[PDB]
């Protein structure tokens, strides 16, 4: 249970809502888009499918709430670009989603206190249409084309992330300006403190401490817990009394080449003439039309047909090959 | 600019008259045979004997104090220069009118 | 519609010059409103072009 | 509570829902977009933050409901273009909102009877290009540039509007056929009546009146507003027994010069040649490219780079200055 | 695909003329459907062009 | 930014060649992050063009 040493945490966000930056528990880390099918591998600050007591529960969510981790609902979790996204997998920091055309990715959830937090990152989403037809619903039976997707195998293989120790979690809420002195409120936790002022200016306290004649800005505290592990996040600071000491853990949902069933453009209204071919193209989505001569000079010509179009193509003695979208090339021969 | 348009004077069973006002781009017009409607029905009693006075004028917008472009007429120019001098092995700064 | 459609001495000035080509239109059937035809802000157009 | 004297009214809408035009209490008046940051100043038919008894309550809304004003909820109020908008200020007829790229602006709310009314206006929204880069999502940290927005301070200062007496509203539901007579049910409102029949056939009543031997079709009533105040609107007629008698009230959300945060384009792959400079431009968002000669003839040229582009620029003896987005101008000089 | 692909005497007429170039295709593996290749409505195309 | 910005002998090879023009930038005020300027994937660009 690799989740024994593993744990959750918090990070910073560039957009928590209405263009304002804050420290969000749903902070975005890495948005992977290696899959050719359109599936996005989103890395978040919180953990999904695990409870605060370290137990598997698919309906529950684990997020960081002011120094302590708290439980939330799986139904409250949402992903969106320009319109809502369909979630196709959740485990720990990772979310799998199929999103429409967008310029900014948004990931959010709802807590126990009925308060919604969401992180927005600028990301140009535009999956490369598979095939030559822009369909919405996937067919059960169709043309087999090579593509890529993230598999649902949980097995510890292939891909891996770097995890380091979370020495002492910084917390400014532990210090308070008591008139002209600084009070350190422990709240049944082991706190490591350091101050610029005289007298006691270092140590590891288990009890409430007070620093005489000092300011909150000239002090620093943080909870200790060098017993849990943390992932190498750029949104979390590096451990002070540590160089490049780090660990590594295998990650689920790897990228693998698969097969996708696409469609084919509808045949156009074809009428023959004296050494020429007339085509009435009716495309439902942007369809590519290409043609070449079957002789010495091929003279390749390509054009993206989008609207109702009539094309007149000259057919030489050698022959003319016309390719209309994902359909097999149509061969034409004149004579006489 | 701000096109200041007040509430239109709807005269039920009568005629309204335009008053020539000294205001920038002042425009006035009276429309005959008007039968306007409100929430609870018709505002006027008469069918075709009603008039509506539509008055308007152009003013400077509230933004003019902040968002504005200035039209200047440049005459002659006065030159002035910042010069660095290495005098007696030390760099000195001289700022004066040219 | 051009740069200078509204001319004032200073941003706090009292008297202003205005040439915007403002004409009132007849209101819609059973409607209380002041419809008008006027050339758009020359300053707003200049800020773009 | 300036909302004691002031009141609300009704108007017209071009789209209340599903492309149908009606008389909406959430009718759109003026949509101001002077702020360079992206803030929109929306003017509506109803009043927010004020109750029917003329009292300040931020959780309450005041809208017109068939001749009489009624109370609603602040939480029910919504603004949207293509996706929902974040409301950053509400006071009276004015709403402040930050909206994404859209072609039609929609403003709505929910009443006491649990019925939702929304007004849609065609408006081309596309926050101007503050700087030299056309980004979508706003960054938390970037280049500081001067801009303007509408602040959320409710405080009665700076801007103001004109107010006065309102007109009379028509209402056939005020008259009733009591056997062979006409009864005018006031319901605690000032009603102006007129009849074809003899006796009392004119006046301004505050009490329930009865017209003996008359028909409902031969009469006509309508509510009026005098004890209350109204804003000098050009869509409402001027008070007959009044010249230029008017009042004035301070308005929330004034315009103030703030600071916008932008980003700087990434350095381009630069390769030098014989009196020429080659740049491989890779823009993430629409970035402006401008260049000039540092001599007698500057010959300024500007172009908006959006895709992968290779640009060859001639460098004269005087020098060539190239500006790529929000980055500092790159200076180039000829050599041997 | 052109204006006149379907010709009838009156909007309520019984007999009609039709030249649409309709050809049936073989159905997909383990699928019950009638796939076909036909030139789109000439009237609908004309209404646009 | 071109085809061959990253060169390796086999898909399972140990040693790799890399020319991507990677330069580190100064982090934002009161922010912990590693900002950088690097030419986009030549292979991903080639797959499109």
CSV table of C-alpha atoms in Angstrom, one decimal, chain D residues 12-330:
chain,number,residue,atom,x,y,z
D,12,UNK,CA,-39.1,46.2,-22.7
D,13,UNK,CA,-36.9,43.3,-23.8
D,14,UNK,CA,-35.9,41.9,-27.2
D,15,UNK,CA,-35.3,38.4,-25.8
D,16,UNK,CA,-36.8,37.0,-22.6
D,17,UNK,CA,-36.1,33.4,-23.5
D,18,UNK,CA,-36.1,31.2,-26.7
D,19,UNK,CA,-36.0,34.3,-29.0
D,20,UNK,CA,-39.3,35.7,-27.8
D,21,UNK,CA,-39.6,39.4,-27.0
D,22,UNK,CA,-41.6,40.6,-23.8
D,23,UNK,CA,-41.9,43.2,-21.0
D,24,UNK,CA,-39.1,42.1,-18.7
D,25,UNK,CA,-38.4,43.4,-15.1
D,26,UNK,CA,-34.7,42.5,-15.7
D,27,UNK,CA,-34.6,44.6,-19.0
D,28,UNK,CA,-31.1,45.7,-20.3
D,29,UNK,CA,-30.5,49.5,-20.8
D,30,UNK,CA,-26.8,50.3,-21.3
D,31,UNK,CA,-23.7,48.0,-21.3
D,32,UNK,CA,-20.6,50.1,-20.7
D,33,UNK,CA,-17.2,48.5,-21.6
D,34,UNK,CA,-14.8,51.5,-21.1
D,35,UNK,CA,-12.6,49.7,-18.6
D,36,UNK,CA,-9.3,48.3,-20.2
D,37,UNK,CA,-9.1,45.4,-17.5
D,38,UNK,CA,-12.3,43.8,-18.8
D,39,UNK,CA,-14.9,44.9,-16.2
D,40,UNK,CA,-18.5,45.6,-17.7
D,41,UNK,CA,-20.9,48.2,-16.3
D,42,UNK,CA,-24.4,46.8,-16.9
D,43,UNK,CA,-27.5,49.0,-16.4
D,44,UNK,CA,-30.7,47.0,-15.6
D,45,UNK,CA,-34.5,47.7,-15.2
D,46,UNK,CA,-34.7,46.4,-11.5
D,47,UNK,CA,-32.9,47.7,-8.3
D,48,UNK,CA,-30.4,45.6,-6.2
D,49,UNK,CA,-29.6,46.0,-2.5
D,50,UNK,CA,-32.8,47.8,-1.7
D,51,UNK,CA,-36.2,46.5,-0.3
D,52,UNK,CA,-39.8,47.6,-1.2
D,53,UNK,CA,-40.1,49.6,2.0
D,54,UNK,CA,-37.0,51.7,0.9
D,55,UNK,CA,-34.3,50.0,3.1
D,56,UNK,CA,-30.7,48.8,2.5
D,57,UNK,CA,-30.4,44.9,2.5
D,58,UNK,CA,-27.5,43.4,0.3
D,59,UNK,CA,-29.2,39.9,0.3
D,60,UNK,CA,-32.5,41.4,-1.2
D,61,UNK,CA,-33.5,42.5,-4.7
D,62,UNK,CA,-36.3,44.9,-5.9
D,63,UNK,CA,-38.1,44.2,-9.2
D,64,UNK,CA,-41.4,45.3,-10.8
D,65,UNK,CA,-44.2,42.7,-10.7
D,66,UNK,CA,-47.5,43.7,-12.6
D,67,UNK,CA,-48.1,47.3,-11.4
D,68,UNK,CA,-46.5,46.7,-7.9
D,69,UNK,CA,-42.8,46.3,-6.9
D,70,UNK,CA,-41.9,43.0,-5.2
D,71,UNK,CA,-38.8,41.6,-3.3
D,72,UNK,CA,-36.4,38.8,-4.6
D,73,UNK,CA,-33.1,37.1,-3.8
D,74,UNK,CA,-29.5,38.5,-4.5
D,75,UNK,CA,-28.3,34.8,-4.9
D,76,UNK,CA,-30.8,34.3,-7.8
D,77,UNK,CA,-29.2,37.1,-9.9
D,78,UNK,CA,-26.9,35.9,-12.8
D,79,UNK,CA,-24.9,37.4,-15.7
D,80,UNK,CA,-23.6,35.3,-18.7
D,81,UNK,CA,-22.2,35.6,-22.3
D,82,UNK,CA,-21.2,32.1,-23.4
D,83,UNK,CA,-20.4,30.9,-19.8
D,84,UNK,CA,-21.4,32.3,-16.4
D,85,UNK,CA,-19.9,35.7,-15.2
D,86,UNK,CA,-18.5,36.6,-11.8
D,87,UNK,CA,-20.4,39.5,-10.2
D,88,UNK,CA,-18.0,42.0,-8.6
D,89,UNK,CA,-20.5,44.7,-7.5
D,90,UNK,CA,-24.3,45.4,-7.2
D,91,UNK,CA,-26.1,48.7,-6.3
D,92,UNK,CA,-29.5,49.8,-7.7
D,93,UNK,CA,-29.7,49.4,-11.5
D,94,UNK,CA,-25.9,48.7,-11.8
D,95,UNK,CA,-24.1,45.4,-12.0
D,96,UNK,CA,-20.3,44.9,-12.3
D,97,UNK,CA,-19.1,41.6,-14.1
D,98,UNK,CA,-16.0,40.0,-15.7
D,99,UNK,CA,-17.2,38.0,-18.7
D,100,UNK,CA,-15.4,35.5,-21.1
D,101,UNK,CA,-15.5,35.8,-25.0
D,102,UNK,CA,-19.2,36.1,-26.1
D,103,UNK,CA,-21.5,37.5,-28.8
D,104,UNK,CA,-24.7,37.9,-26.7
D,105,UNK,CA,-25.0,39.3,-23.1
D,106,UNK,CA,-27.6,37.6,-20.7
D,107,UNK,CA,-28.8,39.1,-17.4
D,108,UNK,CA,-31.4,37.2,-15.2
D,109,UNK,CA,-32.8,36.5,-11.7
D,110,UNK,CA,-35.4,34.4,-9.7
D,111,UNK,CA,-38.6,35.9,-8.1
D,112,UNK,CA,-40.6,35.0,-4.9
D,113,UNK,CA,-43.0,32.7,-7.0
D,114,UNK,CA,-39.8,30.6,-8.0
D,115,UNK,CA,-40.1,31.9,-11.7
D,116,UNK,CA,-36.9,32.9,-13.6
D,117,UNK,CA,-36.8,35.9,-16.0
D,118,UNK,CA,-33.8,36.7,-18.2
D,119,UNK,CA,-33.0,39.4,-20.8
D,120,UNK,CA,-30.7,38.8,-23.8
D,121,UNK,CA,-29.0,41.5,-25.9
D,122,UNK,CA,-26.6,41.1,-28.8
D,123,UNK,CA,-23.2,42.4,-27.6
D,124,UNK,CA,-19.8,41.6,-29.0
D,125,UNK,CA,-17.6,41.0,-25.9
D,126,UNK,CA,-13.9,40.6,-26.4
D,127,UNK,CA,-11.7,42.4,-23.8
D,128,UNK,CA,-9.4,44.6,-25.8
D,129,UNK,CA,-5.7,43.7,-26.1
D,130,UNK,CA,-4.1,45.3,-23.0
D,131,UNK,CA,-0.5,45.3,-24.1
D,132,UNK,CA,0.8,43.3,-27.1
D,133,UNK,CA,-0.5,39.8,-26.4
D,134,UNK,CA,-4.0,38.4,-26.8
D,135,UNK,CA,-4.4,36.1,-23.9
D,136,UNK,CA,-7.6,34.5,-22.5
D,137,UNK,CA,-6.9,33.7,-18.8
D,138,UNK,CA,-5.4,36.4,-16.6
D,139,UNK,CA,-2.0,35.7,-14.9
D,140,UNK,CA,-1.4,36.1,-11.1
D,141,UNK,CA,2.2,37.5,-11.8
D,142,UNK,CA,3.3,39.3,-14.9
D,143,UNK,CA,4.2,42.7,-16.5
D,144,UNK,CA,2.6,45.8,-14.8
D,145,UNK,CA,0.7,48.0,-17.3
D,146,UNK,CA,-1.7,51.0,-16.7
D,147,UNK,CA,-5.4,50.3,-17.2
D,148,UNK,CA,-8.9,51.2,-15.9
D,149,UNK,CA,-11.8,49.3,-14.1
D,150,UNK,CA,-15.0,50.0,-12.1
D,151,UNK,CA,-14.3,49.5,-8.4
D,152,UNK,CA,-16.7,47.7,-5.9
D,153,UNK,CA,-16.9,50.6,-3.4
D,154,UNK,CA,-20.6,51.2,-2.6
D,155,UNK,CA,-19.7,54.5,-0.8
D,156,UNK,CA,-21.7,57.6,-2.0
D,157,UNK,CA,-19.0,59.6,-3.9
D,158,UNK,CA,-17.9,61.0,-7.3
D,159,UNK,CA,-20.6,60.0,-10.0
D,160,UNK,CA,-24.3,60.9,-9.7
D,161,UNK,CA,-27.6,60.7,-11.6
D,162,UNK,CA,-30.8,62.7,-11.9
D,163,UNK,CA,-34.2,61.6,-10.5
D,164,UNK,CA,-37.8,62.9,-10.4
D,165,UNK,CA,-41.4,61.8,-10.5
D,166,UNK,CA,-42.6,58.9,-12.6
D,167,UNK,CA,-45.6,58.4,-14.9
D,168,UNK,CA,-48.8,56.4,-14.7
D,169,UNK,CA,-49.0,52.7,-15.6
D,170,UNK,CA,-52.0,51.2,-17.4
D,171,UNK,CA,-53.9,48.4,-15.8
D,172,UNK,CA,-57.3,46.9,-16.8
D,173,UNK,CA,-57.2,44.5,-13.8
D,174,UNK,CA,-58.1,47.5,-11.7
D,175,UNK,CA,-61.6,47.8,-13.0
D,176,UNK,CA,-64.4,45.2,-12.3
D,177,UNK,CA,-68.0,44.9,-13.5
D,178,UNK,CA,-70.1,45.0,-10.3
D,179,UNK,CA,-73.5,43.9,-11.7
D,180,UNK,CA,-74.4,47.1,-13.7
D,181,UNK,CA,-71.7,49.4,-12.2
D,182,UNK,CA,-67.9,49.6,-12.4
D,183,UNK,CA,-65.8,49.1,-9.2
D,184,UNK,CA,-62.2,50.4,-9.2
D,185,UNK,CA,-60.1,48.3,-6.7
D,186,UNK,CA,-57.1,50.5,-5.6
D,187,UNK,CA,-55.2,48.0,-3.3
D,188,UNK,CA,-53.2,50.7,-1.5
D,189,UNK,CA,-52.1,52.5,-4.7
D,190,UNK,CA,-52.7,55.9,-6.3
D,191,UNK,CA,-55.0,55.3,-9.3
D,192,UNK,CA,-55.9,57.9,-12.1
D,193,UNK,CA,-59.4,57.1,-13.6
D,194,UNK,CA,-61.6,58.3,-16.6
D,195,UNK,CA,-65.1,57.2,-17.8
D,196,UNK,CA,-67.6,57.9,-20.6
D,197,UNK,CA,-70.6,57.8,-18.2
D,198,UNK,CA,-72.1,60.8,-16.2
D,199,UNK,CA,-71.3,62.0,-12.7
D,200,UNK,CA,-67.7,61.5,-11.5
D,201,UNK,CA,-65.7,60.8,-14.6
D,202,UNK,CA,-62.1,62.0,-13.7
D,203,UNK,CA,-59.7,62.3,-10.8
D,204,UNK,CA,-56.8,60.8,-8.8
D,205,UNK,CA,-58.2,58.3,-6.2
D,206,UNK,CA,-56.4,56.7,-3.1
D,207,UNK,CA,-59.6,54.9,-2.0
D,208,UNK,CA,-62.0,52.3,-3.7
D,209,UNK,CA,-64.4,54.0,-6.1
D,210,UNK,CA,-67.7,52.9,-7.8
D,211,UNK,CA,-69.1,54.4,-11.0
D,212,UNK,CA,-72.9,53.9,-11.2
D,213,UNK,CA,-74.5,52.7,-14.5
D,214,UNK,CA,-71.4,52.1,-16.6
D,215,UNK,CA,-69.4,49.4,-18.6
D,216,UNK,CA,-65.8,48.3,-18.1
D,217,UNK,CA,-64.9,49.0,-21.8
D,218,UNK,CA,-66.2,52.7,-21.3
D,219,UNK,CA,-63.6,53.3,-18.5
D,220,UNK,CA,-59.8,53.3,-18.1
D,221,UNK,CA,-57.6,53.4,-15.1
D,222,UNK,CA,-53.8,53.3,-14.3
D,223,UNK,CA,-51.4,53.4,-11.4
D,224,UNK,CA,-49.2,56.5,-10.7
D,225,UNK,CA,-46.1,57.3,-8.6
D,226,UNK,CA,-45.7,60.6,-6.8
D,227,UNK,CA,-44.7,60.0,-3.2
D,228,UNK,CA,-41.8,58.0,-4.7
D,229,UNK,CA,-38.8,59.1,-6.7
D,230,UNK,CA,-37.8,58.1,-10.2
D,231,UNK,CA,-34.7,58.4,-12.3
D,232,UNK,CA,-34.8,60.8,-15.3
D,233,UNK,CA,-35.1,58.2,-18.1
D,234,UNK,CA,-35.8,59.0,-21.7
D,235,UNK,CA,-38.0,55.8,-22.0
D,236,UNK,CA,-40.5,57.3,-19.4
D,237,UNK,CA,-42.6,60.5,-20.0
D,238,UNK,CA,-41.9,63.8,-18.1
D,239,UNK,CA,-44.4,64.9,-15.3
D,240,UNK,CA,-47.1,67.2,-16.9
D,241,UNK,CA,-47.5,69.6,-13.9
D,242,UNK,CA,-43.7,70.0,-13.6
D,243,UNK,CA,-41.0,72.0,-15.5
D,244,UNK,CA,-37.4,71.1,-14.7
D,245,UNK,CA,-37.9,70.2,-11.0
D,246,UNK,CA,-35.4,67.3,-10.3
D,247,UNK,CA,-33.2,65.7,-7.6
D,248,UNK,CA,-29.9,63.8,-7.7
D,249,UNK,CA,-28.4,60.7,-6.0
D,250,UNK,CA,-24.7,59.4,-5.8
D,251,UNK,CA,-24.1,56.2,-7.7
D,252,UNK,CA,-21.9,53.1,-6.9
D,253,UNK,CA,-19.0,51.6,-9.0
D,254,UNK,CA,-16.9,54.6,-10.2
D,255,UNK,CA,-14.1,54.4,-12.8
D,256,UNK,CA,-10.6,54.4,-11.4
D,257,UNK,CA,-7.1,53.9,-12.9
D,258,UNK,CA,-5.6,50.6,-11.8
D,259,UNK,CA,-2.8,48.3,-13.0
D,260,UNK,CA,-3.2,45.4,-15.3
D,261,UNK,CA,-0.9,42.3,-15.1
D,262,UNK,CA,0.4,41.0,-18.4
D,263,UNK,CA,3.0,38.5,-19.7
D,264,UNK,CA,6.1,38.7,-22.0
D,265,UNK,CA,6.5,36.7,-25.2
D,266,UNK,CA,9.2,34.1,-25.2
D,267,UNK,CA,12.5,34.8,-27.0
D,268,UNK,CA,12.5,33.8,-30.7
D,269,UNK,CA,15.2,31.6,-32.4
D,270,UNK,CA,17.5,34.3,-33.8
D,271,UNK,CA,20.1,33.6,-36.6
D,272,UNK,CA,22.2,36.4,-38.2
D,273,UNK,CA,23.2,36.8,-41.9
D,274,UNK,CA,24.7,39.3,-44.4
D,275,UNK,CA,22.9,42.6,-43.5
D,276,UNK,CA,19.8,40.5,-42.5
D,277,UNK,CA,18.1,39.1,-39.4
D,278,UNK,CA,16.1,35.8,-39.3
D,279,UNK,CA,13.5,35.2,-36.5
D,280,UNK,CA,11.5,32.0,-35.7
D,281,UNK,CA,8.4,33.2,-33.9
D,282,UNK,CA,6.5,30.7,-31.7
D,283,UNK,CA,3.5,32.6,-30.2
D,284,UNK,CA,1.2,31.0,-27.6
D,285,UNK,CA,-1.4,33.8,-28.0
D,286,UNK,CA,-1.8,36.7,-30.6
D,287,UNK,CA,1.5,38.6,-30.3
D,288,UNK,CA,2.3,42.0,-32.0
D,289,UNK,CA,5.6,42.3,-34.0
D,290,UNK,CA,6.8,45.8,-34.9
D,291,UNK,CA,10.1,47.0,-36.5
D,292,UNK,CA,11.8,50.3,-37.4
D,293,UNK,CA,15.2,51.7,-38.7
D,294,UNK,CA,17.4,53.8,-36.4
D,295,UNK,CA,18.1,56.4,-39.0
D,296,UNK,CA,16.5,59.2,-41.2
D,297,UNK,CA,13.8,56.9,-42.7
D,298,UNK,CA,12.3,54.7,-39.9
D,299,UNK,CA,9.7,52.9,-42.2
D,300,UNK,CA,7.4,51.5,-39.4
D,301,UNK,CA,5.8,48.1,-40.1
D,302,UNK,CA,3.3,46.2,-37.8
D,303,UNK,CA,1.8,42.7,-37.9
D,304,UNK,CA,-0.1,40.4,-35.5
D,305,UNK,CA,1.7,37.1,-35.3
D,306,UNK,CA,-0.5,34.1,-34.4
D,307,UNK,CA,1.0,31.0,-36.0
D,308,UNK,CA,4.6,29.6,-36.5
D,309,UNK,CA,6.4,32.2,-38.6
D,310,UNK,CA,9.8,32.9,-40.1
D,311,UNK,CA,10.7,36.6,-40.7
D,312,UNK,CA,13.7,38.0,-42.7
D,313,UNK,CA,14.4,41.6,-41.9
D,314,UNK,CA,17.1,43.8,-43.5
D,315,UNK,CA,19.5,45.5,-41.1
D,316,UNK,CA,20.9,48.9,-42.4
D,317,UNK,CA,24.1,50.7,-41.2
D,318,UNK,CA,22.1,53.0,-38.9
D,319,UNK,CA,20.5,50.0,-37.1
D,320,UNK,CA,17.2,48.0,-36.8
D,321,UNK,CA,15.0,48.1,-33.7
D,322,UNK,CA,12.5,45.1,-33.3
D,323,UNK,CA,9.8,44.9,-30.7
D,324,UNK,CA,8.3,41.4,-30.0
D,325,UNK,CA,5.2,41.8,-27.9
D,326,UNK,CA,5.6,43.2,-24.3
D,327,UNK,CA,9.4,42.5,-24.4
D,328,UNK,CA,11.9,45.3,-24.4
D,329,UNK,CA,13.0,46.4,-27.9
D,330,UNK,CA,15.8,44.4,-29.4
